[PDB]
Structures are given as C-alpha cells and as structure tokens.
Amino acid sequence: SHWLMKSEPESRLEKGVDVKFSIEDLKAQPKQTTCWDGVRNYQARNFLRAMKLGEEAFFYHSNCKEPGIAGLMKIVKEAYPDHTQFEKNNPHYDPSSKEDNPKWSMVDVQFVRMMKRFIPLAELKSYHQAHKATGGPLKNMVLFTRQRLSIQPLTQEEFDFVLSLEELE
Template identity: 65%
Template sequence: MPHGKRKAKSEKSKLAKLAKLQKKKDAPKAAPKIFTKWLMKSEPESRIENGVEMKFSFDDLKKEPNETTCWDGVRNYQARNFMRDQMKVGQSAFYYHSNCKEPGIVGITEIVKEGYVDHTQFDSEDPHFDKSSSKEDPKWIMVDVKYVRKLKRFISLKELKQIHLEHKTNGGPLEKLSLFTRARLSVQPLTEDEFKFILQLEEEDPDEELKEEKS
C-alpha cells in the first residue's frame, strides 16, 4: 500500500519536526546574553586592499583628531548586529591587533557614538564598497570609538589562548571567550566577567606567569 507508506513517512517526518520544535520550546530559554564590553580588531601592520592602506594601529587612533575614529568597514552581520543592537555610549572595548606579528590586546577604547550609517558602503573607491546596499535602505553601520589608554602591558593572543584552554578544562571566566569560540568576528562581545578578568591580567608580571608554567 504505497499510499499508506508515503503517508506514514510524512507523518513520521511531521512528528520529527514537531519534536524538534518542542525541544526548542522546552530548552531553557538561553536568555539572550547582554553584552556591555567589547573587543574590536584592527590591523596595525601595512596591508594594501584595492589600492588602499588598511593599517590602523592603536597609536594611529591616538593620532586622530580628538583621539576618535569612526569604525567603518564592518561587513559581517553578526558584528553589525552587536554594534546596532547592543553597543552603547560609554561602554569600553579592548583594542586588539590582528593579522600581525604579535596579535593581542594593546589598549582600551570607549564607545562615544552609537550606530549610524557607514558611508563607505556607497563609495565605489572604498575597499568595503557594497553595491548591493542603497542609501534608501543602508545595510551597514558604524560607531565612533575614542582612545582611552594603553594597557600596562601587552596581553598577547598566545597568553589568552593558554588561559582559555585552562579554563575550558577546569572552568573559569575565559572558557567561552569569543576570541576563540567566534574567532573571525571583528567586533566581539565580552561579558563583564571576561572583561574584568582580562583587565586584571595587566597587573600581573608575565615573566612570573612563565615561571609558574615552567615549574
């Protein structure tokens, strides 16, 4: 009875779908985490993209008028949504040097202007030009960030990774750090605990840590 069989199969898949939906419903509502701290990546070393210099180090930010810049060129939906929905004036962000010899966190910035239209998406000369976007319905936004201060010491990706791995095994504030769980995001969210923990690292002597690791 092919008809019945077909029906049985479709019933089954329907049930499976329902079960899946139910599971989703029952799952403890992963309360959408509210993030109040950030990590923003920038490339400190010279690289040419479509004839345009991409380098923008933490020192470059300090040289900007009012030590402030617009964070243009973000072309990733997750990153955009964080900027659009959660980033607020007054919040702190780590300044992270990526795609360079020594990747890691060099300093702290403050968000001084909330999401507004990123003009570079309309500029055909800009490496981040997006022909699929329109002025009537812009796709991409940016925020303004201001230099606050350098960290007392450079906190390398390597060091953070070691701690992350340790916390993943034994538990700890950096066990879910976006730098490793969502490595490619250029604007990453941090919880208060993650931010505090990393900030406190600047007080430690990295040599002492090294000694501890060796012993």
C-alpha cells in the same frame, strides 16, 4: 555590555587599498577619536548596532607576528551609516546597499588608555585553553569561539580577567 574590536596594526593592502590602523593611529586622531568603518559581517554589524554610549571596548590588534590587546577605548557615538559602503572606490563598497536604508553601519570610539602592559593572543589562548579544562572565565570567550568575528561582546567575567592580566608582570 563590554566589547572587543579588531583592526589592522601593521600595513596591508586589500583591493589595492591599505587598511592599516593600530592603536597608535587612534591616539594620533583629533580627540583620539575615529569612525570604525569597514565592518561587513552581519553578526558583527548587529553588535555595532547594539552598542551603547559609554560602554568600553578593548582595542585588538589583528596582526600575524604579534596579535593581541594593546589598549582600551570607548564608544562616544552610536551606530549610523558607514559612508564607505557607498564609495564605489573603497574596498568595502557594496552595490546592494541603498543610501535610502544602508545595510552597513559603524560607530565612533575615543581613546582612553593603553593596557598597563600589552596582552598577546598567545597569553589569551593558554588561559582560555586552561579554563577550558579546569573551568574559568575565558572558557567561552568569543575571541576563541568566533575565529572570524571582528566585533565581539564580553561578559563582565571575561573583561575582569583581561584587566587582571594587566596588573601582572
């Protein structure tokens, strides 16, 4: 399995709290690792639960001015409870979640490297749209299939094409 994980590159307040966290903030983490908290989308959650140690995931910046894939990271820790679903403080708090059996989960990713060059959502859309008429590996990419999924699986095909655009100028 291969994945795509979205996060806020530039600052933005939610329920009063800032959810900012780009690829650089991950690199700036001890051992360049962090807990990918926040996810409250059932379909997104069930993917987090299905991730295996070692599998890789593109770090996607969900920005307005410059959305795209800036780098790569890996899963070093399998799903477990998201501590913030309970902290009444956090904007992702959930009253319906029992500590006895949490509804929300998270995983731990470690930084690996950056793309040999940034990949704009614009670049991804054109090829995607292109393949969507000629027949290509990005014909059914989730990034364009699910406009609102923060955690997404990618077939080796799509993954191989994203990496190939990395070796182009």
